[PDB]
Amino acid sequence: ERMCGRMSDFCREHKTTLRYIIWGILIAGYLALVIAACVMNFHRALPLFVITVVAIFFVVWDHLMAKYESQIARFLSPGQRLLDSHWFWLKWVIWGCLILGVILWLVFDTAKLGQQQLVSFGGLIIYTSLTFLFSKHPTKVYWRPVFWGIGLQFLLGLLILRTEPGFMAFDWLGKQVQTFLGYSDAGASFVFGEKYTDHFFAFKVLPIVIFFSTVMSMLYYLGLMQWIIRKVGWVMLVTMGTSPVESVVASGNIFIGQTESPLLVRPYLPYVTKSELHAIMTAGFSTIAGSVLGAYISFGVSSSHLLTASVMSAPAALAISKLFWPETETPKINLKNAMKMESGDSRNLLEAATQGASSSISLVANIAVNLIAFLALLSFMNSALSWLGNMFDYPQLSFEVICSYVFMPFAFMMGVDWQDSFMVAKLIGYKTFFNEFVAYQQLSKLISLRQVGGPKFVDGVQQYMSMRSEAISTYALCGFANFGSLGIVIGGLTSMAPSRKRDITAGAMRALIAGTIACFLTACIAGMLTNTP
Template structure:
């Protein structure tokens, strides 16, 4: 028979205050808990005032349950159950209590067994095939290093900081004198390095170096508060750029590592073809962009969502943000968003600091927006790689532009107020809200659908508008016997000086200027698509000019253009940024709108500065079509006689004479290069069949 129990009225005191009683929750298991287990913080580093005793703070200490009443209710419930149910409940309760008592031991046991099996796997793989297992070994060692580093800092970080306080105090007291020695030493080191590098490799590195200085001076001259510029941020931002670029572009380990990483990313993205083939059929690549490129965005978004759920992205972002904060001296919010923009997009990275957005200074808001404009999202990174843009350059640009964005933004709009948040350790990054990894993957795929639709819609619209504008300009130009007049022609002449100051070859600078115009007035997808056409034309070895128009550029110019285009700084993104940030911080909409145009300019210049650093540091491998084109026709830096002879020899070997006047080429060579080599080395090929 059902028992008649009095309704428990002790919850009324809580409900009268709009607070749910933490003791009387649904479920028998929760009713047996005498106290709630609450977090020590509320997610943003603030102590929870209801941590120890919620009833005490509510003034309802009498609301605590009576243990005798609880036991009586449990006994009454057990009487209502059958013997099998009581046995099952007793068995389950025993297991549950055992797990609660030994929870840590069980977790550590399973973790230890997993790690033991993993290390055994790594060792066995290294013994069987060390070359194949080298990447796994390196990643494992890096993970071990950071785990022990985190443990070390957690235990001894405060002691180390305390021991370094005398040094910090000394530097603060004498920094006005010491900084001039530091800045002078850095300046002398850069000048000496540039002089030695120029003497060894030619003058290609000089122009982008002075281009970088020119961009910094222009930003300083038009700064919102020129007298408030903190040069530590500027110098350290450029120094981090230079260090990253030097390691990646000039050292063999760094170059090999990023080339290997680029190959792995390309291989990883190829797995998208499995899903595309299943949905669209075996001939899906016939519609390459729609069925091969856009699905990559969905795949990459899924992976990023899974990494967020596991907490890997938050951990990585915190590490990069910490590095930029301690070196550049920027606020935790700026550093966090800048680090996040290496991996996620312009509207996703501010979500990392969403609870703190209303408290940001206007300079910090400007910095957050500039960082978004100066970088690209990881989800579209894969799409650009699939177009044929070198993966290593895109990955390098994403890393280098993060400190550049902070340096340029804090010069263009310096800080004049005190930030309310000065400690990175007080910022808590939450994991994904999904219940499990499968839900996280599904959520990531679903979240990419609007992005894919937006990319496709924007490309259709912008390319249609571009065609209309070009037709209109051609119609106007035909009135003056110049039907080639187009939007690209205008951009190529207006923006050519900016491209040239990045270190692009003079003849290539018109093409790069055209790409910069497309990126700024339309979007970077349109620009990268056009750049991929130039790359494919060069690799195919087609003619350099068709109807008087240049068809491709040198490998070095392609690399510099890749860095300059690697950012969301365009007028279309301006609306996205204002709308996204405005929805996260409605009370700051006026401040967000007021600094949007400046942030767009700062993001653009940050990309240009990254391209300048790449122009100073990047040295392409000996690519003979580039050597011949620049030496014989572009009036570029003269190649050594040995390189020229070697390249002409390769050209002769790659040329096949089918019929008189009918010659085929491979590896990017063409008839124009063959003519030039025949002038220099007439005995190397049957040049009589080439020149009448």
């Protein structure tokens, strides 16, 4: 017993020092492995060396910003005062310079590119104007979030699309995510056997979703996801000027699904204002999760375009949300509380993985049941429309025919050419009434038809559309905004915050409309930047 007591006392004395020493030893061993790998063959060790260098740089940056925050603020303070003193006259100069730059760039670039590249900008203006017309509180609107959101969308699109080094990186990331979800697919062969490929949707895709959920739970436990969310949220906060919680949610939704994104700020969900809740819902509807990215890339959709649309949607979502539902009440939640995100209660990484996997049970069942019901309803609608048309000697009437004409103006305003506008409208209708999976499947069929080659017109029916229309469709359809998703989001949010149940239902439909409009704005910018083939 005496030896046990002495050992306990010794452990108590050196606890912090022992933890520091063991962590340092582990880090030193990792560095030794890296240096040995570099010594043996640097070319093979290049990725590990790059990862180590970037990790060290980020850690040093974080430590410096933490420790020296006061000094940096003191250094920045005089500049802010000088700018404020001269701001009154200088604001007009800045605005005039920005307008002149916009005019010059638009004229030169878009005029040289062609007429269609300019209709995209026209559609962007039209969409922003229409959102302003039908706003909840038109009189009280803050234009800084809207203008900064559009500017950030433009800058990100310009960098990613007009620069080859930017273009390649997103393709590389898309390939990596596809490979990760391919690893996901293989693991599900055990449970359902090697004949799991027979039932493609139920066996591959739903385990893909489950594995993504488990991985996200594990990363949340480790504390990586939170870091990236904080970085992007700080960028949006320091530029757009939005509230902290809505910014954090918007940053999270880029790689998190709509259902699980509010869990980031669940503890403060009861106290959020109506505007912030509408912003949360709009961000949820306007961005897709990482799980579907692999499947969509597999269909044939471009990885770079998908990732660019996902990144660009969040600023668009916030801007459109602010313009649609401007805030009229003070925000109670503080920045420090919002940025802080509680880690998983799971004791160890494997418990976090188990808890993350278990949650997915409901989601897959809901998705499958909803798909079955809505596809059956679509078949019945097609049969009934065909029956009705036969009376008037037009037996070809169907859901697709109606949706082609109904949604054509939106496709045309986005910058698609006249002929392909109907085809894009069909996809937009499929995305609206049914989940985007089917619309992306149709788009992949069209892309395959174009790639194979052959007659553009087998008969008076067009078979495939141009590359630029495909890019614009990829941007437009990158969202979870569906008439079926409306119910599940309402249910989940009301479950998280029962007190706010009355508020959640009121703003859901406006949130869905705002999400669709944000997708349209992203498509407009992409069309404006992409050249005609």
